[PDB]
Amino acid sequence: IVGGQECKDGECPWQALLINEENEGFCGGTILSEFYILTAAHCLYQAKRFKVRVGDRNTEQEEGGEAVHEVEVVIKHNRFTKETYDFDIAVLRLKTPITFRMNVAPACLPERDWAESTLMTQKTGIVSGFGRTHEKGRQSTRLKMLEVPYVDRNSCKLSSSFIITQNMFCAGYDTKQEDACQGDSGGPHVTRFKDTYFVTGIVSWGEGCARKGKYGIYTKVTAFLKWIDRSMKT
Amino acid sequence: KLCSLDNGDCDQFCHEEQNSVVCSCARGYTLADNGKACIPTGPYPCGKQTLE
């Protein structure tokens, strides 16, 4: 993330972090249940084989409650393709259940119609991660959060060089130096309604990070709720 | 209005049926006796920041 704040303890407990063979964080994830993690499909090409870390809040000091889980099954969207970043979604089912604690608590899946009229109509949502701290910058050590206004789809489309499919949406800022960045990809964009935080997007892509006149592009989750449901029932 | 006004006062999901408002709740919540508020079925419900 570029800009924003740092997540006080227990305020971003649905954050997961995928870690490679070198036990190093390269993509985010979102905890959906004791057993399921939500992520971006393209993060699967950024590592040969990986694991998931919950409750981490700083890479140097062990805060007690961190814990790492093996992935049992990967359900990658069939129609994801590398050249367009369409369908940038995948779900992981673990070999072991994450046990909820202080700082690991799942984020909510909504019901599609209500989310689309009530969640996607809110002014902003909340993105988070350990990803780089500036556009050509270094990966962050401590976990950070960011409030990103929803950017309407028309203005979005006009700001970008590439196609913005309906399985994507815009959030962030025109000129202001705040955005997600590489290493945050796959992690959570949640929208709050009456003090509950529902998964509304996956960090997917963007033109640079914080670029002036460019926003962040997220997998539109509601467009994939049914597919997510079916993955949990197969 | 119905779902337009305070979400039909549902806490979470609001859906229209029978030209009236029908609340639901997310998994790990159950809908209260009053048909709108949502009660946690467990100690770590989804979408809730952890406190001490």
């Epitope: 899946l109 | 859906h15 998994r27």
Partner: antibody, heavy 120, light 110 residues
């Protein structure tokens, strides 16, 4: 009040077809899978299959596939269980029950049951 | 597919006592945790408790569940006249769908 209400007891002969119904009220029917459950007389519960009423997607128990049909009519919030050709062994109580969506593994609301009798 | 074997077939107890019902599952390559149901004569099954630690609304805190892997139990701390019935465990695996135990009859020891 959310309810599942099933149609009443049926009495049929082998070889006849039959359709029983299961009506949801007090919630959006489309938003939950609807499962059917068998209970042979004096016996235990048997899961038969389920349907997603939003798109009528169905999944049958292998033990029951080809012997029964699950269907739905979302305009009237009703699910159905149908046999083209009954056997005496279909004599049992049949329940409908709601299966939530993303991560449910259990049935929160049950219909009152439908008694099915198959006999010459 | 996971076959669930509950035990005992019939449990004979007195009002006031604590009850323990077993269910053992083939913890396959997946598995997880189980849901449990109560059923009284002439009534539909009723969901009591489920998942790692969820409870249906209205279930008194005398009802609790535990176990993991292949071994699970449900415990009732203090039996009420209204508590005597058949109990079913129920599993799901993602690839494996749903299965039930064979039931335990909770009867009054007199």
């Amino acid at each position: 009040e959310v309810q599942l209400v099933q149609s009443g007891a049926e009495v049929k002969k082998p070889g006849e077809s039959l359709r029983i119904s299961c009506k949801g009220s007090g919630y959006s029917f489309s938003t939950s899978w609807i499962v059917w459950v068998r209970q042979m007389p004096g016996k235990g519960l048997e899961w038969m299959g389920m349907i997603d009423p939003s798109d009528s997607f169905t999944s049958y128990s292998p033990s029951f596939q080809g012997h029964v049909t699950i269907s739905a009519d979302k305009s009237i919030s009703t699910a159905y269980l149908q046999w083209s050709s009954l056997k005496a062994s279909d004599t049992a109580m049949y329940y409908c029950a709601r299966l939530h969506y993303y991560n449910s593994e259990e049935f929160d609301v049950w219909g009152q049951g439908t008694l099915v009798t198959v006999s010459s | 597919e996971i076959v669930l074997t509950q035990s005992p077939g019939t449990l004979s107890l007195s009002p006031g006592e604590r009850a323990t019902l077993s269910c053992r599952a083939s913890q396959s390559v997946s598995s997880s945790y189980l849901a449990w149901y109560q059923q009284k004569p002439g009534q539909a099954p009723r969901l009591l408790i489920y998942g790692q630690s969820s409870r249906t609304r209205g279930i008194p805190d005398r009802f609790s569940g535990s176990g993991s892997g292949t071994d699970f139990t449900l415990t009732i701390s203090r039996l009420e006249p209204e508590d005597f019935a058949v109990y079913y465990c129920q599993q799901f695996g993602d690839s494996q769908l749903f299965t039930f135990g064979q039931g335990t009859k909770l009867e009054i020891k007199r």
